[PDB]
Design an enzyme around this catalytic site. Structure first.
Site, short mmCIF file in Angstrom:
data_model
loop_
_atom_site.label_atom_id
_atom_site.label_comp_id
_atom_site.label_asym_id
_atom_site.label_seq_id
_atom_site.Cartn_x
_atom_site.Cartn_y
_atom_site.Cartn_z
N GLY A 176 0.81 -1.20 0.00
CA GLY A 176 0.00 0.00 0.00
C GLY A 176 0.85 1.26 0.00
N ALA A 177 0.23 2.38 0.42
CA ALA A 177 0.94 3.64 0.57
C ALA A 177 2.12 3.43 1.53
CB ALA A 177 0.01 4.73 1.04
N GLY B 21 3.71 0.54 2.70
CA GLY B 21 4.75 -0.48 2.56
C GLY B 21 4.29 -1.79 1.90
N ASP C 286 -10.01 6.67 8.22
CA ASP C 286 -10.04 5.95 6.94
C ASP C 286 -10.88 4.68 7.06
OD1 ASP C 286 -9.36 5.22 4.27
OD2 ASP C 286 -7.45 4.41 4.90
N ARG D 263 -12.62 -2.10 3.26
CA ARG D 263 -11.26 -2.61 3.03
C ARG D 263 -10.38 -2.59 4.30
NH1 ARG D 263 -11.59 2.58 0.65
NH2 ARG D 263 -10.38 4.03 1.92
N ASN D 264 -10.76 -1.83 5.34
CA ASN D 264 -10.05 -1.65 6.61
C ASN D 264 -10.83 -2.37 7.70
OD1 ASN D 264 -7.93 -0.38 5.75
ND2 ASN D 264 -8.81 1.67 5.70
N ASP E 68 -6.09 -0.36 10.59
CA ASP E 68 -5.49 0.82 9.96
C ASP E 68 -6.12 2.17 10.36
OD1 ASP E 68 -3.79 -1.15 8.89
OD2 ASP E 68 -4.73 -1.03 6.97
#
Ligand code: KY9
Length: 272
Positions: free
Chosen positions: A20-21, A23, A136, A140-141, A154
């Protein structure tokens, strides 16, 4: 509990799960030093996290992520500091709830959908109590421990289509802007993982919202469920429900699932 400081010899990477953003995420196995038990783990290794200033910021944040203690929130189990930063949590072997719903949408029933709504509101209520803003929240989280048990991840320290209008226009984030994203998360579940505002470019969303448009009624949703969702997307952040209220209301519906979601006959008609 506390953040364990892990030694690199305590764990192995097995497979790349994603990137992702921040890593790359890997499936791995963690054998705690001393202990005999072997724990499947997810390991996130950050890109270029090597500056002294960010290293301290990351450690300070990691202490807080290791302090959460709730059945519906993922906790950070440990960190490994070498040339890189690696963050370790328990592996949630069914993966994210967005993918799960898209995979299993032909067999997912009303009792599961409404229980997932309860559980996510419970973990969000806990973060609110811990004074932790998500910023966020999205299907998906949300991770799936078992089909019956999901946990938010996250959270803490641009997903325009999940964001409250105030967050988009003013970069304000609070528990109440989290409530808006909650509403969008629920819509993702009830649509069996549809994309919100599909085909409308991000650049236009504040306008649509300012004009007062909102995500449509998911076909399986009864009017009372859609009302909860509509309520999460009011302009006035203090008019939106509170997580505590969302627990009560969805808990009530979960007692009688078939009354509140109607999943019947032609499933091609369950899409918005
Ligand atoms: O660990 C996470 N997910 C995992 N999934 C599987 C295994 S671990 C999630 C996560 N959030 C909440 N929770 C979890 C797990 C359980 C609860 N996290 C915690 C997390 C993450 C990220 C960073 C980071 C970073 C970072 C900061 C600066 C630069 C460099 N530069 C770049 C340029 C910039 C200019 O914009 C200035 C700073 C680089 C990196 C820190 C942490 C935390 F809080 F641990 F310290 C992240 O993603």
């Amino acid at each position: 509990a506390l953040l364990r400081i892990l030694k690199e010899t305590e764990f192995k990477k097995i497979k790349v799960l994603g990137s992702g953003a921040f890593g790359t995420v890997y499936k791995g196995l963690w054998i705690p030093e001393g202990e005999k038990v072997k724990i499947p783990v997810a390991i996130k290794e950050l890109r270029e996290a090597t500056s002294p200033k960010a290293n301290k910021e990351i450690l300070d944040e990691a202490y807080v992520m290791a302090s959460v203690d709730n059945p519906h929130v993922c906790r950070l189990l440990g960190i490994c500091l070498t040339s890189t930063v690696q963050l370790i949590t328990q592996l949630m072997p069914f993966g994210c709830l967005l993918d799960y719903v898209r995979e299993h949408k032909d067999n997912i029933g009303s009792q599961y959908l409404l229980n997932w709504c309860v559980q996510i509101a419970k973990g969000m209520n806990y973060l609110e109590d811990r004074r932790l803003v998500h910023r966020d929240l999205a299907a998906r989280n949300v991770l799936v421990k078992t089909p019956q048990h999901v946990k938010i991840t996250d959270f803490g320290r641009v997903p325009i289509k999940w964001m409250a209008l105030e967050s988009i226009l003013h970069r304000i984030y609070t528990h109440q802007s989290d409530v808006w994203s909650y509403g969008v998360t629920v819509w993702e579940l009830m649509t069996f993982g549809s994309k919100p505002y599909d085909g409308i470019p991000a650049s236009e969303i504040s306008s649509i919202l300012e004009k007062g448009e909102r995500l449509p009624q998911p076909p399986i949703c009864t009017i009372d469920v859609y009302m909860i969702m509509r309520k999460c997307w009011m302009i006035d952040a203090d008019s939106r429900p509170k997580f505590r209220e969302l627990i009560i209301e969805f808990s009530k519906m979960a007692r009688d699932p078939q009354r509140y979601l109607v999943i019947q006959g032609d499933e091609r008609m369950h899409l918005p």
